[PDB]
Every structure is written in C-alpha cells, then in structure tokens.
C-alpha cells in the first residue's frame, strides 16, 4: 500500500494508507495502484474512489485539482470551488465593479459589533480627564 494526501489550500481532507484510488484525470479516467511511476495531471470535478487498507471503501467529492504521484507518495491538491475561465472572469468582474461603486459589505462579526457599541456608548461624555486633575 501507499500513502495518500488530499489537501486543499484551506484544510486537509484525507491522509493515511490506501490500496488503490480511481480518479477522473483531465485526459481520461485513471486508477492508481502502488508503485505507480511518477505522474502529474489535472483532474475534473466529481467523486474520487478510495479503498483504505483492509479494503474499507469511501468516497470523496472533489471540485477539481491536480493529482501528483511519486515513488510512494500520491497527493491531490484539491480546490474549493469550480475553477474555470467561465467563472473566474465573473468573479473578477464583480471585484472590479465593487472598486467603482465603492461598496463595502459589513463584516459578520456580531460579537465585535455589540462589544464595540457598548464601548462607544459607555465611553461617551465621560469627561473624566477634566474632573480628575490629571494633566496630560
């Protein structure tokens, strides 16, 4: 058996020892057994088949990535969303637009919001430095 890593830029999705995997590589469905010679390829979105040593199968869903193989290491630099010149251009168009209309979305941190609000209200018209005679 060999050692498989499925990792995203954000997080890691699998590790450990495996007997085989079956991967829909760019230029045609593919399947890796131990010892496989060094290889490198993109892969298409969709499932991947893992069978863990002692034959315990499990699936994983991948949105894309690159598959790479070395003597005993195989890894799959998955990625988190469908990547394609169709979608990335839309993303970049939205990012350019927001630079023009000068939008800003609010962060979602409701706890910082509440803490900062109570702080702003508590610290108002406190006028302390006039009252304690501290010079500053």
């Amino acid at each position: 058996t060999y050692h498989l890593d499925v990792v995203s830029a954000e997080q890691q999705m699998f590790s450990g020892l495996v007997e085989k995997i079956q991967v829909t590589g760019s230029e045609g469905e593919l399947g890796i057994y131990p010892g496989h010679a060094p290889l490198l390829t993109a892969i298409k979105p969709g499932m991947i088949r893992i069978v863990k040593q002692h034959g315990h199968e499990e699936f994983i869903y991948l949105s894309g990535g690159i598959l790479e193989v070395q003597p005993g290491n195989v890894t799959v630099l998955a990625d988190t969303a469908i990547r394609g010149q169709d979608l990335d251009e839309a993303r970049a168009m939205e990012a350019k637009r927001k630079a023009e209309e000068h939008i800003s979305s609010s962060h979602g941190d409701v706890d910082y919001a509440q803490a900062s609000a109570e702080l702003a209200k508590a610290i108002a018209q406190l006028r302390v430095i006039e009252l304690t005679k501290k010079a500053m």
Partner: protein, 117 residues
C-alpha cells in the same frame, strides 16, 4: 397590582410580552447601528418590526391635547388595549406599515388608517 392573581393571566402575559419585545429591541438597536439592518435573522427583523409597531401603538391622542394638535381625542377600553397588543405581538397585523399605528387610538383604527396611507 401587576401580577396574575389580580389582573388575570391574559393581561399579565400581554404586558410581560410587550416588555420582552421592547427589551430585545433595545439589544438590537446597537447591532443595527454598526452592521445595518440586513445582517439580522428572519425573526430578528420580525422582532424589530413588531417592536417598532408596539412602540408606535402606545401613543394616543387626547381630548385635552386636542388643542395642541387639532386631532380629536380617543378613549380606548382595556379589552381593546389587550386585544390590540396581543394581536400585534402574535403577528396578525404584520401586513400594515408602521405609521398606521401612530396616534391611532383603538386597534381597528389602525387597520382603517392603513388604507389611506
């Protein structure tokens, strides 16, 4: 005198409900200031709408203030006060805009005033 034994559970619960709504709206004002309305939950935006409608509906025109504002006064019986606030909190009148409740008097006058706005 505000305890169930004397005012009845209906009244006591309607009163405590108004208090609860407003006491939550006080929490939410200072989220709305920093983050704007849209980051609230569905029921948070709904609590806010009902809180503002309750806060409006507690206003009333007086026969003696009739001289400052010109608007004629209204007398609201206790049955109708409880019925109105309970109807607002349950969400029966969620389909009226806020200003239908300002200086309205009785609750029926809200459903009537909402037409002309």
């Amino acid at each position: 005198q505000l305890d169930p034994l004397v005012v009845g559970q209906e009244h006591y619960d309607t009163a405590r409900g108004v208090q609860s709504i407003l006491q939550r709206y006080q929490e939410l004002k200072d989220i709305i200031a920093i983050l704007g309305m849209d980051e609230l939950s569905e029921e948070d935006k709904l609590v806010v709408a009902r809180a503002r409608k309750i806060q409006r509906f507690l206003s009333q025109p007086f026969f003696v203030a009739e001289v400052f504002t010109g608007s004629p006064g209204k007398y609201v019986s206790l049955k109708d006060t409880i019925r109105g606030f309970k109807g607002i909190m349950e969400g029966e009148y969620d389909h009226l805009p806020e200003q239908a409740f300002y200086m309205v008097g009785s609750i029926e006058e809200a459903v009537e005033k909402a037409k002309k706005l």
